[PDB]
């Protein structure tokens, strides 16, 4: 079973009839461990004309958020320390220009407090959570690595414009190299989890009857069978 690989930088132009100009995406999943299937969407409204914001989509967030806040929300509030990460050439006025209107957007939030706030003390605390378990979940969910991702989020918005400025073509959607193939071994995983997780909460039910062996090891036998027999993976 073929499937567009994950953890890679792409960029797509989106048709004249649409409030969005171009967009870049990146599918992320832990190479070893659960394998979450939540993708990061860093859109770019305002077509290649109209008077051009930059918003990105996060898991559980209703609307989309403007990149600026995301920097201050990480731990970098001042400029030039930000372009440090984005641009690797102070003499690239073109790129820089585009960004101007955007800084003004977030100009209304001048610190980390409100930054982690606007995402609707309880939420701010929750905000952190959404950065260690939702924000770019691959790479690692440890703690003291905040810095690196900032350089990433800079390298992305970069790769973006590099196309949005007709310097690099739109990413070849069917460039097989950026496609993987889940053979037998891999399949028995994403399938298993769905099961074992129902097995997890099954042994939870027996303990929720014990007003004080039992495990019918056929559900892991018959479950597997169902799929392989018919062709219906998911439980």
Question: Which residues contribute to the site for other proteins (CB under 8 A)?
Answer: 2, 6-9, 26, 31, 49, 51, 78-81, 84, 87-91, 93-94, 97, 100, 103, 110, 138-139, 147-148, 151-152, 155, 163, 165-169, 172, 174-176, 181, 183, 185
For other proteins, the closer of residues 36 and 220 by Cβ is: 36
Provide, rounded to whole angstroms, the least separation between the CB of residue 125 and other proteins. 27
For other proteins, the closer of residues 190 and 223 by Cβ is: 190
Quick one: three-class SS letters along 126-168?
Answer: HHHHHHHHHCCCCCCCCCCCHHHHHHHHHHHHHHHHHHHCCCC
Provide, rounded to whole angstroms, the least separation between the CB of residue 91 and other proteins. 5
For other proteins, the closer of residues 30 and 220 by Cβ is: 30
- Placement of tokens 């600026």 in the chain: 68
For other proteins, the closer of residues 133 and 167 by Cβ is: 167
Provide, rounded to whole angstroms, the least separation between the CB of residue 148 and other proteins. 6
For other proteins, the closer of residues 7 and 222 by Cβ is: 7
Provide, rounded to whole angstroms, the least separation between the CB of residue 200 and other proteins. 25
């Amino acid at each position: 079973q073929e499937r567009s690989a994950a953890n890679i930088v792409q960029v797509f132009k989106k048709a004249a009839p649409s409030p969005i100009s171009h967009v870049a995406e990146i599918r992320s999943a832990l190479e070893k461990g659960s394998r979450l299937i939540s993708t990061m969407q860093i859109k770019l409204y305002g077509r290649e004309d109209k008077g051009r914001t930059i918003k990105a989509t996060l898991p559980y967030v209703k609307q989309d958020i403007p990149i600026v806040i995301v920097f201050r929300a990480l731990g970098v509030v001042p400029d030039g320390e930000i372009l440090q990460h984005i641009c690797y050439d102070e003499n690239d006025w073109q790129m820089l220009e585009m960004l101007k209107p955007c800084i003004e957007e977030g100009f209304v939030i001048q610190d980390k407090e409100v930054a982690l706030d606007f995402i609707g003390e309880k939420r701010i605390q929750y905000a952190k959570d959404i950065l260690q378990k939702e924000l770019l979940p691959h790479i690692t969910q440890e703690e003291g690595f905040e810095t690196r991702k900032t350089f990433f989020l800079g390298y992305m918005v970069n790769r973006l414009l590099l196309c949005a400025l007709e310097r690099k073509d739109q990413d070849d959607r069917d460039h097989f190299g950026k496609k993987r193939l889940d053979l037998a071994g891999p399949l028995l995983a994403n399938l298993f989890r769905i099961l074992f997780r129902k097995l997890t909460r099954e042994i939870y039910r027996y303990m929720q009857r014990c007003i004080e062996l039992a495990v019918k090891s056929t559900t892991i036998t018959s479950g597997l069978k169902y799929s392989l027999a018919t062709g219906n993976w998911g439980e």
